[PDB]
Amino acid sequence: NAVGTGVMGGMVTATVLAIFFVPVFFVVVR
Amino acid sequence: GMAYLFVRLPSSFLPDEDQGVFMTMVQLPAGATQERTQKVLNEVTHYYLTKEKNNVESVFAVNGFGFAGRGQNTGIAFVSLKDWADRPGEENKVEAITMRATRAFSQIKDAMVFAFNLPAIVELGTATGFDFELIDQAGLGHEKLTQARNQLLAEAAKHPDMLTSVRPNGLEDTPQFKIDIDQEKAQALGVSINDINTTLGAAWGGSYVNDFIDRGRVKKVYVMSEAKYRMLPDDIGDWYVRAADGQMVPFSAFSSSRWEYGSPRLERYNGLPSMEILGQAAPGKSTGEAMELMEQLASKLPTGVGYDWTGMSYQERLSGNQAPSLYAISLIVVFLCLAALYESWSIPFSVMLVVPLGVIGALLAATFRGLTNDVYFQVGLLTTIGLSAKNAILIVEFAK
Amino acid sequence: GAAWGGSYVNDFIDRGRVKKVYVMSEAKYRMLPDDIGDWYVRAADGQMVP
Amino acid sequence: AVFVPMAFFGGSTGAIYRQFSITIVSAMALSVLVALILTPALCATMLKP
Amino acid sequence: GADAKTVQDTVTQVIEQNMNGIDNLMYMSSNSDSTGTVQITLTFESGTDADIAQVQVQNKLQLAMPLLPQEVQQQGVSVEKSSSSFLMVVGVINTDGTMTQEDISDYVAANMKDAISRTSGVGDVQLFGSQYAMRIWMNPNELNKFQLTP
Amino acid sequence: DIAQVQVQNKLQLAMPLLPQEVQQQGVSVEKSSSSFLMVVGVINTDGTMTQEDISDYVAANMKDAISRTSGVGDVQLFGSQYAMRIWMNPNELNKFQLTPVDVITAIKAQNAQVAAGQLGGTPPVKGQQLNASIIAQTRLTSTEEFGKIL
Amino acid sequence: LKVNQDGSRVLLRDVAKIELGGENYDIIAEFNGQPASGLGIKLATGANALDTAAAIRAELAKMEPFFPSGLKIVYPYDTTPFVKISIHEVVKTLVEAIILVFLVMYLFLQNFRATLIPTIAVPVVLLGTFAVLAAFGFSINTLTMFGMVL
Amino acid sequence: DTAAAIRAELAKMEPFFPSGLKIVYPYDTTPFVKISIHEVVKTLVEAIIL
Known part of the structure; x- marks a missing residue:
């Protein structure tokens, strides 16, 4: 549980977020 | 909020995962008898067999064998729970069962009220608070050694703000029957100081004499005298020892008695006599916080009295000393490799910025469920950092 | 031997520390040859003998 | 760089981070190499457009 | 049949004072039960040669073994990789x-x-x-009658 | 290390051959x-x-x-660590008709821990309630106790 | 023990009850109230795999045949089923995580022929992992298996 | 490290010493190593500015 949980939790908010911010804190980091 | 949720989320080592096995320890007072203790071990086996027969498969009880103490006074009880399957709801799991029992044996004449689980990983359960050792660095003794231990256990018991559950380790201090031979009054009586001792010892302590073969196996021959003639003080007299002249002489003729005090478990730490003090951190405080205090409280103690830390407080630990240094590197070398295939100094920033996004989910999920910040969460965190950078990288990459 | 060389007998606790007990005879009685005689040893019969 | 740099068995816990930090980097490099040959090889020699 | 004090002074100490020059060693935690038993424990840095250590100690003990009473020796000492x-x-x-x-x-x-x-x-x-052993349970009265001691 | 040990054991095949005075002193092997x-x-x-x-x-x-x-x-x-020194006087000894042998013999039996058992132990008479250890002679501790030997 | 004046004799038997007893009657145990004995085994620092227990049920293996009527080995307390059930319930986790991937794989690129590639790639790597592993000593552990899936 | 850890044991011994006991240090291989280094790292730095 320990393993997986943090793994999943983090993975969701890492996919539905990094998919919007990455395109940003990249453009910006110019 | 990530840092917040992160400082909020508490930490540990590894989860006490129910191992369909566990054990309860029994401990009677001073001078308690094998019979008395056994009454206790019995009250204990009854529970698991009656009020918990549903979860308990078998009990293995041992009277006269603790994790210390040893001898008629301590007991152990290896329990073997039923198959994992036949034990559904958390209700029938180890933590629950041990809990119910702890509260159960609570109502008994002797502090044994325990049972617990197998510290996550055998021998490696060195994360349950602290270990304190009091040393007798001067010519002092058991007198002053312990006499400064009650005095320390006070100062810490008084303020349960930064210290909880501070006690010693089965030192007790039960009475002792002190026999004193009146040498001359005996040397004069025609009796060797030797025949006297071997007689007092052979009779009440036992004497390993010779060996003998019992069914093609060597075994020992012991001399000790029946039980009935060594259960009570007065009995000391019943024993007669030969004299040079030729006639027996009772013990009472050449020796006096008197109850004194001693310790059934004198101990030492690195040559010097010592006394071990255990205890818990404190509700919401780490070992360190709880310790700095323990070092201070000692200072008050008489002169000669000193200290040291043993196993379960000889080191400083992870989150709070380790990870905050290595974690540096992990994302310190990240800004490297992220240049070895980018070359911008600024562009590897993008990928880096992701990291927090995943850490927020991991912390979120972590807090919602009971879960704590431990090795596995940690483990998970890194991999989470990886996957993040993964996605980021490609996006950034293809972009470039 | 006990007199001129010393003899490690028993042990004893001196301030919660085990240490040794030695038997050797004062210095003055073992600095010179002639001194060898000063020493008497018990006899079966009961009387000392130089 | 995030995995390996933990393999520093620092302390009674490195007893596990070790047991950890590697199992992955290995599994990874494997996967990286694997994903370098065979995979491209397969996905290139394998099935319809 | 020896008290914690006689077995701490008589054995525990003659064996603790003889633990010197031992490669790696974080500390030694001795005990001395009224049960008549002692049990010094030595701990070594992680990764310390389990075996060579398990032996060093089982030999620096000898520089002491002939000092323990004849009853403890006749019993036998036990050293090991706990x-x-x-x-x-x-x-x-x-x-x-x-x-x-x-x-x-x-x-x-x-x-x-x-x-x-x-x-x-x-x-x-x-x-x-415990493995059997021939137990001889003396009767003091009888012994005294026939005029005999243990 | 392995050497430092081989020698500390091939010595044993000899240790029981050294006089009782050398053994009682103790041998010392080591990585000089x-x-x-x-x-x-x-x-x-x-x-x-x-x-x-x-x-x-x-x-x-x-x-x-x-x-x-x-x-x-x-x-x-x-x-050198202290030790209880007993400096014999031959004259005095001779007067009272005693040799250093009586003096040793004396010490050895008046200064020594003696193991006596306990009250109600190991195999007890069912029904016993008390269980205490017995204490007998216990090694001397002061130059003074030694002076009173008989 | 002595030949008496009146021609008679006093034998040990006359001054002591003589029977085979334990060497010590301190510890006594019961397995569910039924009298019993047992083996309280341990490990040797940095000992081996279950191999120890693997080979404990090795010695006992052949001991069972010459046991008298009434002797039945019983197993309270045992770290084994864990390892057995700790694995199982991981290898399953690994298998499932595969069928799971094969699906997500499909649901995106309808093609039992493509979806088959990543299906051939994952196992391969895992295999190769126990390899690089052993190469560094690490063993298949109830702790190494996680990082496998993770 | 040996001497490093010799002044480790003595470290805590000093506090319970009676009046009159003062550790003193005749003979010591340490300052060498300390001054042997120093006077090399300097040599290395200087060879750089040079």
Whole structure:
């Protein structure tokens, strides 16, 4: 549980977020 | 909020995962008898067999064998729970069962009220608070050694703000029957100081004499005298020892008695006599916080009295000393490799910025469920950092 | 031997520390040859003998 | 760089981070190499457009 | 049959004072039960040669062994690579009353343990009970009548 | 290390051959170097100490520790831990008609820990309630107790 | 023990009850109230795999045949089923995580022929992982298996 | 490290010493190593500015 949980939790908010911010804190980091 | 949720989320080592096995320890007072203790071990086996027969498969009880103490006074009880399957709801799991029992044996004449689980990983359960050792660095003794231990256990018991559950380790201090031979009054009586001792010892302590073969196996021959003639003080007299002249002489003729005090478990730490003090951190405080205090409280103690830390407080630990240094590197070398295939100094920033996004989910999920910040969460965190950078990288990459 | 060389007998606790007990005879009685005689040893019969 | 740099068995816990930090980097490099040959090889020699 | 003090002064100490020049060593935690037993424990830095250590100590002890009373030696000292935390526990019971705590143990001690304690059963084997032994239970009265001491 | 041990064991095939006086002293085997690595000295800032004293304060409180630390090999103690010295007077001895043999024999039996058992132990008469250890002679501790020997 | 004046004799039997008893009657145990004995095994520092227990049930293996009527081995306390059930319930986790991936794989690129590639790539790597592993000593552990899936 | 850890044991021994006991340090291989280094790292630095 320990393993997986943090793994999943983090993975969701890492996919539905990094998919919007990455395109940003990249453009910006110019 | 990530840092917040992160400082909020508490930490540990590894989860006490129910191992369909566990054990309860029994401990009677001073001078308690094998019979008395056994009454206790019995009250204990009854529970698991009656009020918990549903979860308990078998009990293995041992009277006269603790994790210390040893001898008629301590007991152990290896329990073997039923198959994992036949034990559904958390209700029938180890933590629950041990809990119910702890509260159960609570109502008994002797502090044994325990049972617990197998510290996550055998021998490696060195994360349950602290270990304190009091040393007798001067010519002092058991007198002053312990006499400064009650005095320390006070100062810490008084303020349960930064210290909880501070006690010693089965030192007790039960009475002792002190026999004193009146040498001359005996040397004069025609009796060797030797025949006297071997007689007092052979009779009440036992004497390993010779060996003998019992069914093609060597075994020992012991001399000790029946039980009935060594259960009570007065009995000391019943024993007669030969004299040079030729006639027996009772013990009472050449020796006096008197109850004194001693310790059934004198101990030492690195040559010097010592006394071990255990205890818990404190509700919401780490070992360190709880310790700095323990070092201070000692200072008050008489002169000669000193200290040291043993196993379960000889080191400083992870989150709070380790990870905050290595974690540096992990994302310190990240800004490297992220240049070895980018070359911008600024562009590897993008990928880096992701990291927090995943850490927020991991912390979120972590807090919602009971879960704590431990090795596995940690483990998970890194991999989470990886996957993040993964996605980021490609996006950034293809972009470039 | 006990007199001129010393003899490690028993042990004893001196301030919660085990240490040794030695038997050797004062210095003055073992600095010179002639001194060898000063020493008497018990006899079966009961009387000392130089 | 995030995995390996933990393999520093620092302390009674490195007893596990070790047991950890590697199992992955290995599994990874494997996967990286694997994903370098065979995979491209397969996905290139394998099935319809 | 020796008290914690006689067995701390007489044994524990003659064995602690003789633990010197030992490669790696974080500390030694001695005990001394009224039971007449002592049990010094030595701990070594992680990764320290389990085996070479397990031996160094079993020899620096000799520079002391001839100092322990004849009763402790005649018993025998035991040095080893502990772990302090069982790895399994087979129990032996009486399917018929023909056996007993006194018996069952001994059937074990003399036929099961010797074997299991020199196998993969590394470290040590605690035998719950005791191998038989010829016990001679003296009667002081009788002894005194016939004019004899133990 | 393995060498430092091989020799400390092939010695045993001989140890029981050395006189009882050498064994009772104790043999010492080790990984020498023959050439000090540092030398702390301890002095008397006040005359309250002396060569005889200072050493002993060390021997019994500083060396034991320093010789099982990183202080690998061995530690030479410049002086000697105290010991109870009994300086015999032949004249006196001869007067009272005694040899050093009686003096030793005396000590050996008046200064020594003797193991006596306990009250209600191991196999007890069912129904016993008390269980205490027995204490008998216990090693002397003061120059004074030794002076009273008979 | 002595030949008496009146021609008679006093035998040990006359001054002491003589029977085979334990060497010590301190420890006594029961397995569900039924008298019993047992083996309290341990480990040797940095000991081996279950191999120890693997080879504990090795010695006992052949001991069972010559046991008298009434002796039945019983197994309270045992770290084994864990390892057995700790694995199982991981290898399953690994298998499932595969069928799971094969699906997500499909649901995106309808093609039992493509979806088959990543299906051939994952196992391969895992295999190769126990390899690089052993190469560094690490063993298949109830702790190494996680990082496998993770 | 040996001497490093010799002044480790003595470290805590000093506090319970009676009046008159003062550790003193005749003979010591340490300052060498300390001054042997120093006077090399300097040599290395200088060879750089040079």
